[PDB]
Design an enzyme around this catalytic site. Sequence first.
Site, PDB file in Angstrom:
ATOM      1  N   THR A  16       0.753  -1.372   0.073  1.00 32.06           N
ATOM      2  CA  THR A  16      -0.439  -0.236   0.306  1.00 32.06           C
ATOM      3  C   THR A  16       1.101   1.477   0.168  1.00 32.06           C
ATOM      4  O   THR A  16       0.635   2.517   0.062  1.00 32.06           O
ATOM      5  CB  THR A  16      -1.052  -0.339   1.564  1.00 32.06           C
ATOM      6  OG1 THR A  16      -0.453   0.049   2.356  1.00 32.06           O
ATOM      7  CG2 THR A  16      -2.380  -0.745   1.046  1.00 32.06           C
ATOM      8  N   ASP A  39       4.008  -8.200 -29.386  1.00 34.60           N
ATOM      9  CA  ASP A  39       5.778  -7.117 -29.567  1.00 34.60           C
ATOM     10  C   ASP A  39       6.410  -7.535 -30.723  1.00 34.60           C
ATOM     11  O   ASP A  39       6.197  -8.375 -31.659  1.00 34.60           O
ATOM     12  CB  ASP A  39       5.720  -7.495 -27.870  1.00 34.60           C
ATOM     13  CG  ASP A  39       6.552  -5.974 -27.661  1.00 34.60           C
ATOM     14  OD1 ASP A  39       6.287  -5.853 -26.819  1.00 34.60           O
ATOM     15  OD2 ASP A  39       7.528  -5.627 -28.117  1.00 34.60           O
ATOM     16  N   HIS A  69      12.350  -5.845 -25.915  1.00 29.02           N
ATOM     17  CA  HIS A  69      12.192  -5.349 -26.181  1.00 29.02           C
ATOM     18  C   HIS A  69      10.800  -6.160 -25.695  1.00 29.02           C
ATOM     19  O   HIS A  69       9.894  -6.135 -24.878  1.00 29.02           O
ATOM     20  CB  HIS A  69      11.090  -3.724 -27.239  1.00 29.02           C
ATOM     21  CG  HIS A  69      10.616  -3.654 -26.271  1.00 29.02           C
ATOM     22  ND1 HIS A  69       8.893  -4.021 -26.703  1.00 29.02           N
ATOM     23  CD2 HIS A  69      10.239  -2.133 -25.793  1.00 29.02           C
ATOM     24  CE1 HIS A  69       7.811  -2.514 -26.465  1.00 29.02           C
ATOM     25  NE2 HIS A  69       8.463  -1.685 -25.394  1.00 29.02           N
ATOM     26  N   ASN A 161       4.351   7.275 -24.855  1.00 29.10           N
ATOM     27  CA  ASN A 161       5.090   7.452 -23.350  1.00 29.10           C
ATOM     28  C   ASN A 161       5.494   9.448 -23.876  1.00 29.10           C
ATOM     29  O   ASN A 161       6.631   9.972 -24.299  1.00 29.10           O
ATOM     30  CB  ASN A 161       6.609   7.289 -24.115  1.00 29.10           C
ATOM     31  CG  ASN A 161       6.231   5.447 -23.861  1.00 29.10           C
ATOM     32  OD1 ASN A 161       6.221   5.778 -22.442  1.00 29.10           O
ATOM     33  ND2 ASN A 161       6.767   5.006 -24.486  1.00 29.10           N
ATOM     34  N   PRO A 175     -11.234   3.321 -25.823  1.00 32.94           N
ATOM     35  CA  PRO A 175     -11.665   2.795 -24.590  1.00 32.94           C
ATOM     36  C   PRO A 175     -12.330   1.706 -23.393  1.00 32.94           C
ATOM     37  O   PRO A 175     -11.591   0.926 -22.290  1.00 32.94           O
ATOM     38  CB  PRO A 175     -13.437   3.435 -24.519  1.00 32.94           C
ATOM     39  CG  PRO A 175     -14.117   4.043 -25.326  1.00 32.94           C
ATOM     40  CD  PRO A 175     -12.546   3.876 -26.330  1.00 32.94           C
ATOM     41  N   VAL A 177     -10.685  -1.341 -23.510  1.00 31.51           N
ATOM     42  CA  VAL A 177      -8.928  -1.953 -23.669  1.00 31.51           C
ATOM     43  C   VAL A 177      -8.743  -1.314 -22.771  1.00 31.51           C
ATOM     44  O   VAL A 177      -9.374  -0.462 -21.830  1.00 31.51           O
ATOM     45  CB  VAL A 177      -8.074  -2.556 -24.647  1.00 31.51           C
ATOM     46  CG1 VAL A 177      -8.745  -2.970 -25.594  1.00 31.51           C
ATOM     47  CG2 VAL A 177      -7.568  -1.036 -24.398  1.00 31.51           C
ATOM     48  N   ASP A 200      -6.938   4.381 -17.079  1.00 29.72           N
ATOM     49  CA  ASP A 200      -7.897   3.598 -16.560  1.00 29.72           C
ATOM     50  C   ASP A 200      -7.128   3.034 -15.420  1.00 29.72           C
ATOM     51  O   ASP A 200      -7.825   3.376 -14.114  1.00 29.72           O
ATOM     52  CB  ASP A 200      -7.942   1.871 -17.277  1.00 29.72           C
ATOM     53  CG  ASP A 200      -9.262   2.122 -18.410  1.00 29.72           C
ATOM     54  OD1 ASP A 200     -10.719   1.824 -17.812  1.00 29.72           O
ATOM     55  OD2 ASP A 200      -8.537   2.047 -19.120  1.00 29.72           O
ATOM     56  N   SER A 224       5.512   1.005 -22.074  1.00 29.27           N
ATOM     57  CA  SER A 224       5.696  -0.331 -22.207  1.00 29.27           C
ATOM     58  C   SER A 224       6.296  -1.195 -21.099  1.00 29.27           C
ATOM     59  O   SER A 224       5.721  -2.707 -20.906  1.00 29.27           O
ATOM     60  CB  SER A 224       7.263   0.075 -23.297  1.00 29.27           C
ATOM     61  OG  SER A 224       6.662  -0.123 -24.789  1.00 29.27           O
ATOM     62  N   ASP A 260      -2.785   7.797  -4.096  1.00 32.89           N
ATOM     63  CA  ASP A 260      -0.635   7.862  -4.058  1.00 32.89           C
ATOM     64  C   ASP A 260      -0.080   8.333  -4.485  1.00 32.89           C
ATOM     65  O   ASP A 260       1.330   8.913  -4.511  1.00 32.89           O
ATOM     66  CB  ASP A 260      -0.465   6.275  -3.880  1.00 32.89           C
ATOM     67  CG  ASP A 260      -0.643   5.201  -2.318  1.00 32.89           C
ATOM     68  OD1 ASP A 260      -0.616   4.439  -2.298  1.00 32.89           O
ATOM     69  OD2 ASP A 260      -1.235   6.013  -1.209  1.00 32.89           O
TER      70      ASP A 260
HETATM   71 CA   LIG Z   1     -10.710   1.011 -20.155  1.00 30.25          CA
HETATM   72 CA   LIG Z   2      -1.097   4.201  -0.448  1.00 32.05          CA
END
Ligand SMILES: [Ca+2]
Ligand SMILES: [Ca+2]
Length: 279
Positions: A16, A39, A69, A161, A175, A177, A200, A224, A260
């Site tokens: 956490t 990939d 990669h 990136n 949206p 995925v 997400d 990635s 966080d």
């Molecule tokens: Ca989504």
């Molecule tokens: Ca936390």
Amino acid sequence: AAQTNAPWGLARISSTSPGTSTYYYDESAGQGSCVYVIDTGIEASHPEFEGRAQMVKTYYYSSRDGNGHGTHCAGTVGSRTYGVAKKTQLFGVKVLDDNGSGQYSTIIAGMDFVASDKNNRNCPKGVVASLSLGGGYSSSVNSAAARLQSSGVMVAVAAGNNNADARNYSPASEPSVCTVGASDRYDRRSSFSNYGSVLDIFGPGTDILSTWIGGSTRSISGTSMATPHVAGLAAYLMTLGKTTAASACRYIADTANKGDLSNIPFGTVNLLAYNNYQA
Ligand SMILES: [Ca+2]
Ligand SMILES: [Ca+2]
């Protein structure tokens, strides 16, 4: 189970709070699930995969990962030392060349291939696809990602990136995925990570140690790298029976560490992938 002196990203998804060094996870470890890594390929012979990886399709002259990669991403999904789901089965689909590049037509073919191929495999706990790739917006690429998800595969994709809104990138902007941003070991948004309402979830993406070609290891950064953390976590949770391919992204968001992260733009979720393990 506990892995001491784990890579920080693994420790982070089982805590956490930032700053811990042990990865805590259930021993089932994704056994019985399957993850397709779409990939540059996978060095299946790497000792770290323990015979659990294989190439199933290439769109180039060889099935070999001549880049690194794909092997790195696969390692974060399911290698022994560097992986989230240490007993999952890995399937490599090479849609990117050894320079890390690929045409959209080939990437789309690779997604449609996975949607069909999974019907030939024994994956009783379910199927995940990890896509650490993308480029400018394409409705055709988004549509292919949507098809793959609809076919019963948990699809995780990199946000990109560009330190920009992911709405202008594909398949990030689809949206349906699971679109994954990157964070660093101090719980900041990675400086390169895309953001926006279509994201997400975040996963560790800066300075991620994993497998590399030539039987080696190295640390690299990107969305990635965050994406296979989430793909591996989904495989792990599906094996535990906590969720299904259709709802894993939602379940991961529901059970994430919330609030966080720092340097999250207003309108972007503040959610960090978390496995909720309790011994
Ligand atoms: Ca989504
Ligand atoms: Ca936390």
